[PDB]
Amino acid sequence: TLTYPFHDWSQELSPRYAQLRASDAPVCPVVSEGTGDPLWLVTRYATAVKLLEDSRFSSEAAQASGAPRQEPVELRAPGTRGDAIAMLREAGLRSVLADGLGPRAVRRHQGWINDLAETLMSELASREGTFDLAADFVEPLSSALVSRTLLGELSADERDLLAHCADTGLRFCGVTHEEQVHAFTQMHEFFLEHARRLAGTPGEHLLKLIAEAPVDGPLSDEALAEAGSLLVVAGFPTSSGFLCGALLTLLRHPDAVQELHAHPERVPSAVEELLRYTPLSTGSVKRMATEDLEIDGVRIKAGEVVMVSLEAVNHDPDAFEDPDVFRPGREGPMHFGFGRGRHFCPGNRLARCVIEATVRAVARRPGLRLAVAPEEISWHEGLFFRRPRAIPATW
Ligand code: HEM
Ligand SMILES: O=C1N[C@@H](Cc2c[nH]c3ccccc23)C(=O)N2CCC[C@@H]12
Ligand SMILES: O=C1N[C@@H](Cc2c[nH]c3ccccc23)C(=O)N2CCC[C@@H]12
Ligand SMILES: [Ca+2]
Ligand code: NA
């Protein structure tokens, strides 16, 4: 009877996750609030590893039109496929995706990324009074990441349109179903008109590499538009949400920032602890059983969908000692912030790059603090990917 999700839109995780984790079942039944579909939910690290490393639990089947789902509307423009990353790997573009997202891309971009983080923070430090870290730091940094490494250079109006589409479509509630569907239509139509132009501009952004890649015909306009929409939904609200949330974590732990100021070699460990500690998605990764399967004794029938809450797994006390403590350099198992298994985040190298640049910018300037109490922060309610409306801050 427990409905999903748990409406924990701020950084305070729903107590339900710890309740289910401690129950006498390794997988617990829930019901989608948005569709009424029955779903399974996993909250334990050990069980999550077993699920996400078993390829008979399929991500593509759980994404497909008509699957039991946690979200109220399908995450695709009506009439399109909506399985972009599979379509691209299918067309044989794994080598291309690695070139635009892997370590070689990080080496191309890390210089200007760190310059931009410093320039943005330096500007804020020159101001008298308070400022807004979301509007004045995260938005320009995440927008530059999307323009320069993924899509090609966007105007402010185009960036605002894509941001609004992502915020409207990637929601559990707070907008009508038809508004949500039309957000995906608008984004698809944007790239039908503009993807070729964006791919043709100078630079090495991923969309250009995709459009220029030989495919055993070259990618059609619809396929390139689905690639554009993928890069927005997977890269934009995730990066902006996480950087906002990571800044809040740092601002609430001045002792840890002071340690990083004195010992910059410890920043990479802080990046990894932020990926474990800072909650991002309010939903779960999910997979469909492609046949009758068993998870730690519980029978999962073919066609049923099993969810894993990455936040729940990242706060599992059997995996991490004192899991609700922000402890850079804790020496436990690998976090689940980027997932697990074959679908591990391919953006993880660029994400780590921008997170590291942000942590270093903060650590160089101790004294940065929230200008309001954490409880006074206002949160966007119903987003898949948590984000505060503003982060008032000052030195
Ligand atoms: C440029 C930035 C990013 C890009 C281009 C990107 C891209 C992608 C793509 C294309 C996928 C789909 C993989 C698949 O289904 O096989 C994915 C998955 C994922 N991403 Fe990223 N991502 C970015 C940033 C982030 C950030 C900041 C996080 C922070 C937690 C994140 C967490 C994840 C997770 C957990 C998954 C796994 C989903 C699953 O297992 O079903 N991503 N990413
Ligand atoms: O490439 C995908 N992977 C999975 C997980 C996911 C990864 N990033 C996401 C962002 C929003 C929703 C889901 C995801 C998915 O549900 N997908 C629909 C939109 C993108 C597609
Ligand atoms: O909230 C969601 N999370 C992703 C998985 C994910 C979990 N954590 C993530 C972090 C970044 C990207 C994707 C994820 C997913 O598959 N969804 C389908 C409907 C809602 C949406
Ligand atoms: Ca169905
Ligand atoms: Na798999």
Numbering used by the authors: 3 to 218, 220 to 398
Sentences from the paper on this structure:
Further, the in vitro assay confirmed that NasF5053 could produce NAS-C (47.4%), Asp-A (44.4%), as well as a minor product NAS-B (8.2%) (trace I). Our systematic mutagenesis studies on the promiscuous NasF5053 and the versatile NascB identified four key resides, Q65, A86, S284, and V288, which play critical roles in controlling product regio-configurations and stereo-configurations.
In the substrate-bound NasF5053 structure, two cWL-PL molecules (cWL-PL-E and cWL-PL-U; E and U indicate extended and U-shaped, respectively) are present in the binding site, with full occupancy. cWL-PL-E adopts an extended conformation and forms multiple contacts with the heme group, loop β3-1-β3-2, loop αB’-αC, and loop αK-β1-4. The hydrophobic side of V288 also protrudes towards 7-propionate of the heme and indole ring in cWL-PL-E. On the other side, cWL-PL-U is mainly in contact with the heme, αI, αB’ and long loop αB’-αC, including a T-shaped stacking interaction network between the F388 side-chain and the indole rings of both cWL-PL-E and cWL-PL-U. The DKP ring of cWL-PL-U is further restrained by the side-chain of Q65 and extensively stabilized by secondary interactions with water, 6-propionate of the heme, N10, O19, O18, the side-chain amide of Q65 and the backbone NH of A86. Multiple hydrophobic interactions are also observed with residues lining the binding site, including V236, L233, I87, and Q65. Importantly, the indole ring of cWL-PL-U is positioned perpendicular to the heme group plane, with N1 forming a hydrogen bond with the heme-ligating water molecule, consistent with the initial step of N-deprotonation reaction by P450 compound I6. The indole rings from the two substrate molecules also form a T-shaped stacking interaction with each other.
